[PDB]
Amino acid sequence: FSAGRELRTQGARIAGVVSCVPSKQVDNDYFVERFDASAVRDVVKMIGVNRRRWADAQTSAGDLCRKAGEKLLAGLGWQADSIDALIFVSQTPNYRLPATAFVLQAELDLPASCLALDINLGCSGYPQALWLGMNLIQTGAAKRVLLAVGDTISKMIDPTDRSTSLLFGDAGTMTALETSNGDAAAHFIIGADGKGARNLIVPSGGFKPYDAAADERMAGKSPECLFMDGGEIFNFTLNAVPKLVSRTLDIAGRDKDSYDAFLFHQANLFMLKHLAKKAGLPAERVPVNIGEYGNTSCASIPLLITTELKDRLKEETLQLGMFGFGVGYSWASAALAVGPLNIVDTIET
Ligand SMILES: [Cl-]
């Protein structure tokens, strides 16, 4: 397990996925006054982002997940009393305490027997949420699980920082998991390297402020905002993720060309292109929606499913690989069959 823990589940399936994005659409024009048009043009070419959605002050990740959840439950026809666990994966919770999972439990009318867990993960979070939820179902702790995976990273961006300002958008998602009777297996790999903490971090805002003054890379940066060392993240990613993809493919037992899609965290288009090439993946089978939504952090994979795979999922079972990487450092994969599904949708606030 030198390159991550290998995990297998059976007896659980994805039953539906809904994404909810802010109705506020922010075009690149927005940024030309503060940043030079030429510089904006060159950066957005590389990152691939034409538009993104930004939450207003009264809209949180929890709110986006609640609205997605309402739509998902209505579509599935699942009664609130039937939900056994809700896991909220986010870096932008409502409160320091209580956890936002409790707010969602109450707002969705879930029962007292519904487990409520907030877990702090970023870009690597979706495959981990899938694994945890499917493990709960396999082990008989649950029959129906909701995964509320969302973020409003726009609220942590320094508006004077060009790289982060142009990159991030906001989204919230809800994924339904249910007990399944087939013999189909899901495979996951989950890895961590906390030595990367200082390369993707919000220095101030928690209970042990990072020593930003002592870090030359942070000169002129706001400590309450997101810091990213792009060069370090690129090198981390280009090394760890192709190995993750290879090993995931090997343990899932299916030929590369029999996958319907390889769903990557939408880090930036330059990175996505480099990863697909290094992993020898066919570019047409690597969906991208960063152009319309920006990088939506932990929401990026489920948002990709709803915006890019809705029509294909209606009709067939898809063989999917999912690869998340980022903050922690952390990286994670899922490889499994999904669908057909009728409840796959993208709504706005
Ligand atoms: Cl451009």
Author numbering: 6 to 35, 39 to 284, 286 to 358
What does the study report here?
By using an ortholog rescue strategy for insoluble or difficult to crystallize targets, we increased our structural coverage of B. thailandensis essential genes from 31/406 (7.6%) to 49/406 (12.1%). Ortholog structures may also be useful in designing broad-spectrum antibiotics with cross-species activity, and by representing a variety of functionally conservative point mutations in the active site may be useful in developing drugs less susceptible to mutations that cause drug resistance.
